[PDB]
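Researcher: Following up on the earlier apo prediction. This time include the ligand. It's magnesium ion, with the SMILES given after the sequence.
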Amino acid sequence: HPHGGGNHQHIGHPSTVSRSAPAGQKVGLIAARRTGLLRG
Amino acid sequence: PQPKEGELVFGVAHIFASFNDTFIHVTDLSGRETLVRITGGMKVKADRDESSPYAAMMAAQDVAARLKELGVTAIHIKLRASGGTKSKTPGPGAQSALRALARSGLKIGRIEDVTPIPTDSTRKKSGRRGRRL
Amino acid sequence: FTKKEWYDLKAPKMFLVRNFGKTLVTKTIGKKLATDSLKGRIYEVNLADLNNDEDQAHKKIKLSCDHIINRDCYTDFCGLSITRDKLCSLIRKGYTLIEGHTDVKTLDNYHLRMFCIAFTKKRQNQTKSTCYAQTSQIKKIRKKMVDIMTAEASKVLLKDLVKKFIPESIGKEIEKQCKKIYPLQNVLIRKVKILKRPKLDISKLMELHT
Amino acid sequence: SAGDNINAKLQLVMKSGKYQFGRKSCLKALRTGKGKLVIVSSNCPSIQRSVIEYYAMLSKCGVHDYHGDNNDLGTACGKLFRISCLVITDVGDSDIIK
Amino acid sequence: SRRTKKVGLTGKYGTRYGSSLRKQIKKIELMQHAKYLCTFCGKTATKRTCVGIWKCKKCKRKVCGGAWSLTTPAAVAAKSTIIRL
Amino acid sequence: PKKRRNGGRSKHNRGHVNPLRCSNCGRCVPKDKAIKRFNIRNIVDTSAQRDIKEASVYSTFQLPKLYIKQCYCVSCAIHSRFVRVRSREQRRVRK
RNA sequence: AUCCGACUGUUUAAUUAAAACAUAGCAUUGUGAAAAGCCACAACUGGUAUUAACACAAUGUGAUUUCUGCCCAGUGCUUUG
RNA sequence: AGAGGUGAAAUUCUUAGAUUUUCUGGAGACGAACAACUGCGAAAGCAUUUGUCUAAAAUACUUCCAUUAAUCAAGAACGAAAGUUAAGGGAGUGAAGACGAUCAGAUACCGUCGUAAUCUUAACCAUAAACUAUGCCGACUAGGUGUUGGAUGAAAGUGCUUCCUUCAGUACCUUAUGAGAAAUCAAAGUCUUUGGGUUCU
Ligand SMILES: [Mg+2]
Ligand SMILES: [Mg+2]
Ligand SMILES: [Mg+2]
Ligand SMILES: [Mg+2]
Ligand SMILES: [Mg+2]
Ligand SMILES: [Mg+2]
Ligand SMILES: [Mg+2]
Ligand SMILES: [Mg+2]
Ligand SMILES: [Mg+2]
Ligand SMILES: [Mg+2]
Ligand SMILES: [Mg+2]
Ligand SMILES: [Mg+2]
Ligand SMILES: [Mg+2]
Ligand SMILES: [Mg+2]
Ligand SMILES: [Mg+2]
Ligand SMILES: [Mg+2]
Ligand SMILES: [Mg+2]
Ligand SMILES: [Mg+2]
Ligand SMILES: [Mg+2]
Ligand SMILES: [Mg+2]
Ligand SMILES: [Zn+2]
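Model: Understood. Below is the ligand-bound prediction.
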C-alpha cells in the first residue's frame, strides 16, 4: 500500500491524488476539489 | 436619423442619485441600446464631491453635448433613489442634474419616480441598536 | 461603435397616433440578422401620447413587437400599469381599501391577471370621522370583484377587452353592483399581466394594422 | 350536516323500532320482504354489497350508503363491535325513511 | 410491579453501546413492533413481516409500506396531492 | 419617577406589537412608539421648477410629487429637532 | 487505588496473545451509465452488475459524554481562458 | 472607465467588462402603504387570498335544572428570545474569527468579509423590566367627551344611513368636607369611626 510503513503510522504524502494517476497509485482522495468540514 | 420637419426624437434618461454618486444614463425608449453615461464621478478627483451639485452639472452638460451630436432632441425622465433596503430619498445631485438638463436646450417629455420599494423587506443592515455615533 | 441604422415603431389601430417613435440597432453581420435583435423588445408608452388627450395621463401601455417589414416594427399589446404617484395620491388615513386578483382566459386562449383596487366613501349625512368597513362586507365585495372580472374578461376577445380597458367600464360595473353593501369611491384596474399567448399568426397581426 | 342528521335519526330507531345487524339477517329479511331500509358501511367488501343491492332492487327496498366505517357504524348504534350492514324492519317514532 | 424505570424495551442490551444509541434504538423499535389498523377489514391486526412488507393477521392482505412504520409522511403527501386533483 | 401615564407609547388591551426600523439609524422600535411623519415634497424648488415648464412639451405640465412616510426612533428624532423637550405641564398637550 | 484499550471478536503453525488488528459511531472524496466511476486483459472482451445516489467505489478516526482553536506563505489537489 | 464606502480614507470589485438598463428562468425568508391612545386570546402571542375542521364570547328569550358556588397547599396543562439533540433547508442579517481605519494604547464605537444561529419537521430546556413593577370573586360612591359589538324607539330613505335609550368591552378630561410621605390615584376611595370571602409574599 502507498500508506504503509513508518515508525509512527502516518501517511507522509498529500492524500489528494490526481485523476490521471495509474491503477496501483490512485488510493487516497481521488481528484478532490476541496477538503475539510463542509460549511454550507 | 432622418426626421421629418417639426417632429422630435425622444430618449429615456435614467437618473440615479444615492448620497455617494450620481448617474445620468440615456437609452432609447426600449431600455436596450444605451447611448451615453457620464456618472458624475468622472468629473472630479477628490473621492468626495462625487455627489455634489457641481459634478452633476458637468455630467449633464456632457450628456447634452453628446446627445445633440447624435441627433436626439427630446428626453423622458425616470428618477431613482437607490431605495431597496437602503434610503428612499434621492441624493443632493438630482436637482442640479435636472436643472442643467432643462437649461441645456433639450425638450422634456415626462417625469416619473421609479424607486424600487419592497412590499417584502428582507432584513436591514446593522442589527438592532442600529448605527451608533 | 456608431454604425447603426434607425427603424420606425407603429401601434395597432385601437389607438390613434400609430407612429410613436424610433429605435436604433447595429447593422447586420455574419449570422447577426439584425431582426433577431429587434423582435421581442418591450416598449412602454404613457397612453396620453397614444390617444392625444391629457385626461388619461396615467395608465401606461406596454407594447411588444413581433413582425418586421423592411423598416418598420408593428408592436402589438402586452400589458398595463398605473403610474405610481397616482396610486400614492389615492391612499388617505381614515378609509379602508379593498383588493383582489383573478385568472381568466379569452376566446383567443390568452391568459391574464387583472388586479383591481377600491376604497370606501362618506355618505355625507354621517358627521363621523372614519369610514371603516367590517370584514364580512370586505369578503362579499371581493367576491363580487372576482366574479365580475371573470365574466367580463372571459366573455369576448382580446382586442375588445383592450378597448374596454380604456374608458374603465369594469370599474363602473363593480362600483354599481356593490353599492348595496358599502359605497365605494374610485375603482380601477391597477395592472394586467399577460401570462401565455397562443401562437404568432402574422395574418391576424397585420389585420390589426389594416 | 347530513352525517349528523343520519346519526341522530339512528338513535330513535335504536330506542324505538325493530332491527337486526349482520349479513345473514339482512339477506333473510330481504328474501321474505320484511325490510324497510338497509344501511351498508363504506368499508363493506365488494362482493357482499353487490348481493345486498341486488336483493334490495328485486325486493324494492332502499339502500342509503353510510358515510362511515365498520367501527363508525357500530359506534353510531350503542354497540361495542363493528357492524358493516343492518336492516330496519320497523321504523319506530323516527322519520328515517322520508 | 414496574420492573424498570427508564430503559423499558432496550433492557436486553445491558450496559453496552452507550445511552444515546440505546435511546434511538428504543424510538425506532417502538414503531417497528406495534399494531396498525387494516383499512380493508377494520380490525387492528397488521404487523410487519419483513423490512417493507406488512400483513394483516385476519384477512391476510399484504401492503407495501415503510421500514419501521406502515406509512411515511413523504408518500402521504404525494398521495394526498394527487387525490386532491 | 413614573414620568408618563402611558409609559411613552400607546398600547392597551394587547400583549405584543411588532417592530419597525428607524429611517435614519436602522434601530428596532415597536410600531406604536416610533414617531411617524408623512411628507409630500416636490421634485425641485420653485426656481428650477419654472425652467422645466418652458423647456417642456404639452404646454400644460404638472410636475409629480413624492411620498415618503419616514419613521424614527426617539434618539434619532430629538437630535434632529422633529420633537423637543417640554415642561412638565406642557408634556400633556396633544394635538 | 493508578496506566491502556470502550465492550463480544482476531493474530506472528514451532521463542512475542498485547496497549497490536477488527468493530459499531463520526467525517471527507469520486460518479447520472452501455462515449459514466473504480478495477482486469496480448488482442478480442470482462468484474462490481440478477446493480442505479437510503447505490457502488476510495480514504481517515475509532462506544457514550463534553469539545474540536489560529495559518492557504511552502508542497499537493482543483476552477476559469 | 471607474464602482463601493466614510467625518476623511483604507481593505474590496473591475477591459478576462465592474457599476449601470432590459428581458427570461430558479431559490429562501418576509407580508410595506391601509394601520389607529382600534380587534381577539389564560398568559406567552396573533396581520396576503380561498376551503375544511375547531372552539369562544357579547346580545335577545314568559326555554330547561334548582344551589350544582368563591378561592385554592399537594398535583396537572401551556409558556417570547437565547441554548441542546436529529434530519432538512440555507437568499438576507450576522455572537465567534480575520482584516482596514481612529487613538498615547483601542482585543471597542465606524468600514470590508464571514462561521454557528435565525426558517421547517420530531424531541428537550421552564427562564425575561414574562410590567399595569398593582392577585381573584362580590357591594357602594361623580359629571363630561369619544370609540368597538348587539338590541329597542323615532326621522331625513332611490327597508339603508342619522338621532334617542339600554347591555357588554375600551380609552381620555374636569373635580373630589375622599386618600396618600409625595409623585399622583375613579381606585392606590368607603381605615385609630380599624373585621364582606380567600390564596401568595
Ligand atoms: Mg510503494
Ligand atoms: Mg493513529
Ligand atoms: Mg449620540
Ligand atoms: Mg411583554
Ligand atoms: Mg480489548
Ligand atoms: Mg476477548
Ligand atoms: Mg510463536
Ligand atoms: Mg506464547
Ligand atoms: Mg486500534
Ligand atoms: Mg469505519
Ligand atoms: Mg475515546
Ligand atoms: Mg496552497
Ligand atoms: Mg380591525
Ligand atoms: Mg443542522
Ligand atoms: Mg449566506
Ligand atoms: Mg455583510
Ligand atoms: Mg431549521
Ligand atoms: Mg423570575
Ligand atoms: Mg413581578
Ligand atoms: Mg385592618
Ligand atoms: Zn385486515
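Model: Residues 39-40 of chain A lie near RNA strand H (CB under 10 Å from a C1').
Researcher: Noted. I'll compare it with the apo version next.
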